[model samples]
Target: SGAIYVGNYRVVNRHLATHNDWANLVWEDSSRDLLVSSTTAQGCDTIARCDCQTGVYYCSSRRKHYPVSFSKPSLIFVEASEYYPARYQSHLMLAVGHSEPGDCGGILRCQHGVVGIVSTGGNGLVGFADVRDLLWLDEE
Candidate 1:
């Protein structure tokens, strides 16, 4: 028999880019859920996912930067492959962070058909459900 090893799990987000605000973008085969979460260990570790038809969202805790105080904070963008085109018609998800100015909001696109902002707060998270309306494209 081999030696046994013990280790603790910290929910490592193995999908974040360097200097990015978002963390791992994962897909679950059992639930067919596309999910996204943040890598901010110190701040709110927001998490979102699609539940029903491959897209639904839920979050815990909250963190945001002010316009006057902080100017603008970093934002995390997530995209799924449910209500989108063939390119995004899979059971996967991806997230990217915009650390630059003027891009401090989260953008959500339903494949290639619909696009919108699920989050308007600075350094916030955006999630998706079903794209039932086109007006959702309007950034709030």
Candidate 2:
């Protein structure tokens, strides 16, 4: 679904009463991901998937720490096309790294800064960004 943006209201237009028209979205993938794994095995044994899950969550919530993994600058955004859905805002997209959760809806970072939350059943990296619609708005 899509939304109409003529004034100051937004919603996933269920019925195209006003029409959503069309949009331009860009999405791609490369670098054959055949051998991607986490770096937690720095003398650590090969633990199960649950271990990694517990490791990431417990580390952040209880230990007040982030998982020990290499960071990559694969962050990207969805530029506005000619419609309100994609025109309203740009979103975060990136490649998920090795041995990470398939549903890491947690902290999404760029460099060393916390950018947004992770989401999307992407190849690996979670997609989450652009909070303009959340805290701010423009008339452009």
Candidate 3:
């Protein structure tokens, strides 16, 4: 019954899940997941736990969404953050973008569902995982 603005999108009436795992920084390295922290109508993990045949990543960098697509089960590299223990050696979804310079993570959504969460970015890209990985995280 509520809505919010996300840069160019109104995000009206869209139900953003508030699962307990919203605060999880790590989802097991094997699951290939990570966590999220954005400055927008954020909802939130990470790891490539979910699939991504095609997806869109929304972030506060400009409140803009980026169109992306790549096969699943693929590995992408990201630099490590030693300061914050959670960001250290965390998993990531390799993607190329126009230096959005966002926080640790954002929302990477699919055409019909939530896909993954963005963690970090660099000279030309970003990071995130899928929600499917939360199956076990939720069952517990």
Candidate 4:
């Protein structure tokens, strides 16, 4: 569902009555994800996957911690498009040896100085970035 945004307050109110749930939404992935796996025999980590929908949850990490495996957090947001439902198969949100780690408590990090991209997966890198790095959103 989509909400209508009109210029006048009265119009906005009238639209709201017919589109209450579509006004604004904060989407979150509500699935069980293992996020990270145990180290392999050769001393490497393998990224795993869970259920991902149009608007759902994903993963994050700190990059400066590269060459070594670090824990990441699950992030939730709306998928930018129908082509991006399963993020791991869609784009490279974080490039290996190219991105940096997030702050001690930051979920996203990179050499580009923290642009906004919704990252969901990785390939044995130290950290990760957000969706803004992987996709572009135009102003309407």
Candidate 5:
């Protein structure tokens, strides 16, 4: 399983799409269709369901790593919307990446700095400028 940010905490999972377990979220697939897939922590392949014609995407389930395997650790307050369940603190790690808006097109090794938008997924590129080039937050 890979780790991704949900609020300020990180969790190992096959997929992440909502604020909480099965929490309802709605987004449009303006580009065309939504295609999301990931391998579960248990090595299961999962795919998300999307409706292209209606521009709706649904994430019905979430798989997390061993939740009780870690002990609760102290957490420092950060942002208001950022909440990390105490039970998952032991698995927490600090990571850094681009937190501002900027174009990555210039880094694509073109003849010149060609600023442009990369492929826009059905759900759009959340927390990233390019889907192909993602910054993974690591424990510093």
Candidate 6:
């Protein structure tokens, strides 16, 4: 594994209201459930996933492993791509760092009509998820 450095590394949960349906953006796993925990040794991890149909979200602890399934389904919204074509409508673009802003990677797309990250860092895709999302805690 490469050197991982996440500045602050703190999770700040903030919710917003929007009508955009993020159902197709649900990352599918082996089962109907999803896992979003980090594989870091420092344990400054984070995770969050919701069901597309039922909207049920199951999130666990940050430093520990414990699934806390929500009692009721929560409404989540995902933005649509305004620049991509109709085929890439669901593409989610994100900005990185202070400069070079446009499509700074993290654009999720659907394959075979399914939204998920099938393979990463293979072709023209961005780098590893762990490395891309890492924030330098010692950056000066």
Q: What is the C-alpha local distance difference test score of candidate 1? A: 0.23
Over 4 Å off, model 2:
1-90, 98-104, 110-112, 132-140
Off by over 4 Å in 1: 1-101, 104-107, 123-131, 134-140
Q: Candidate 4 on 1-140: residue-level lDDT in tens?
A: 11112121111111112333234322212121112111112321111232221121123232233322223333433233222353332222322332212221122323322222233332333222222321111111
Task: List ranges where model 6 is wrong by over 4 Å.
Answer: 1-8, 16-43, 46-131, 137-140
Which residue ranges in model 4 land beyond 4 Å of their true spot?
1-23, 26-88, 97-106, 110-113, 121-123, 126-129, 133-140
Q: How far is candidate 5 from the true structure (C-alpha RMSD, Å)?
A: 18.6
**Candidate number with the higher TM-score (1 or 4):** 4
lDDT score of model 4? 0.24
**Best first by lDDT, ranked:** 3, 2, 4, 1, 6, 5
Record all residue pairs in model 6 with backbone atoms less than 3 Å apart, i.e. clashing: 7-137
lDDT of each residue in 21-140, candidate 2, tens digit only = 213111111211101111211321121211111122111223233443322323444332222222222243343332122322344333323333333222433333322222222221
> Against the true structure, candidate 3 has what lDDT?
0.44
Off by over 4 Å in 3: 1-50, 71-76, 80-91, 99-101, 137-140
Q: Rate the local accuracy (lDDT) of all candidates.
A: 0.23, 0.26, 0.44, 0.24, 0.19, 0.20
TM-score of every candidate relative to the true structure: 0.18, 0.26, 0.51, 0.22, 0.17, 0.16
lDDT of 2 at 4: 17
Q: Order the candidate numbers by TM-score, best to worst.
A: 3, 2, 4, 1, 5, 6
Winner of 1 and 6 under TM-score: 1
Pairs of residues clashing in candidate 2: 95-125, 96-124, 96-125
Ranking 1 against 6 by lDDT, winner: 1
RMSD for all candidates, in order, please.
16.1, 17.3, 9.2, 17.9, 18.6, 17.7
lDDT of 5 at 104: 14
lDDT of 5 by residue, 1-140 (tens): 12223222232221222344224322212221111222223322111121111111111112211111111112322222122122221111111212111111111112221111111111222111111211221111
Q: Write the per-residue lDDT of candidate 1 for residues 10-92, one digit (tens) a residue.
A: 12112212233133322211122122233333331222222222221222222332111111112223343222222222222
